[PDB]
């Protein structure tokens, strides 16, 4: 993560006005709905029969709530995304076995949730900035696969 001062501000300014509670479940939710196979990891959450059931399952808005944390966390430790995610990398890999290609799917659905919640404020340059961050994050968790 380089984040030039221009980008550094775009990511901070925006990220600061983010509904850290709701936005977190908004992503996880749409992931299970748009990429069905992913529900294969949250069968202990409940009814994921329809999108309405997924967009309401309390187990989901509680997990997405914890996911968003790791971000605010990594976002406050760009200079080292590897160290911060060491723990979660061992968890998602040698225990959950999620494929690293699915960390990119989640980082993008997130970018779509931010684009939806901030509409126009979410300018192209603001995206190209977050895309870098998401990417940097998707590479830390995938780190333990070596």
């Amino acid at each position: 993560v380089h984040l030039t001062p221009e980008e550094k501000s775009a990511v901070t300014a925006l990220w600061g006005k983010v509904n850290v509670d709701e936005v977190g479940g908004e992503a996880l939710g749409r992931l299970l709905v748009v990429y069905p196979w992913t529900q294969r990891f949250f069968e202990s959450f409940g009814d994921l029969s329809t999108p309405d059931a997924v967009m309401g399952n309390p187990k989901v808005k509680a997990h997405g709530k914890k996911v968003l944390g790791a971000f605010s966390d990594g976002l406050a430790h760009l200079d080292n995304l590897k160290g911060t995610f060491a723990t979660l990398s061992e968890l998602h890999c040698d225990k959950l076995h999620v494929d690293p290609e699915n960390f990119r799917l989640l980082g993008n659905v997130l970018v779509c949730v931010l684009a939806h919640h901030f509409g126009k404020e979410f300018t192209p340059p603001v995206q190209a900035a977050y895309q870098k961050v998401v990417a940097g994050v998707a590479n830390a968790l995938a780190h333990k696969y070596h």
Binding site: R30, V33, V34, P51, V111, H116, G119, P125, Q127
Partner: protein, 141 residues
């Protein structure tokens, strides 16, 4: 494959886009070139600065090639049959780039239609662009 429920959401969401189609078609391109720098190696003779009337003009091509799909959805492999040779045969556009675009195209729609960009239509749109991407790459298969 696309289901009747999907068809309805694509035709629904595209309708609500209407008039701005071309506009939107050039906002996805800029987002791409910016977020995915590597995709510019295709538009040298192009000006990729914020105002390029070349990017605006192209956004109309893409936008109407898509509107050409939503209206003939049950038959894309024939309507798009032509854009299949150009992207695969003449241009040699790497298949990954069709993914990078489609993404920016969903990140554009959500920033313009915060009402109907429901988790469902979102999924319907992603399947639709997934089918378009498949057809334009088909000439490789």
């Amino acid at each position: 494959v696309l289901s009747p429920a999907d068809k309805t959401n694509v035709k629904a969401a595209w309708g609500k886009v209407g008039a701005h189609a071309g506009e939107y078609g050039a906002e996805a391109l800029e987002r791409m070139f910016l977020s995915f720098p590597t995709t510019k190696t295709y538009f040298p003779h192009f000006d990729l600065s914020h105002g390029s009337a070349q990017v605006k003009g192209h956004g109309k091509k893409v936008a109407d090639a898509l509107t050409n799909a939503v209206a003939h959805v049950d038959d894309m492999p024939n309507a798009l049959s032509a854009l299949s040779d150009l992207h695969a045969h003449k241009l040699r556009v790497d298949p990954v780039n069709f993914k990078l675009l489609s993404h920016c195209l969903l990140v554009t729609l959500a920033a313009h239609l915060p009402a109907e960009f429901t988790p469902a239509v979102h999924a319907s749109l992603d399947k639709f662009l997934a089918s378009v991407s498949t057809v334009l790459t088909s000439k490789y298969r």
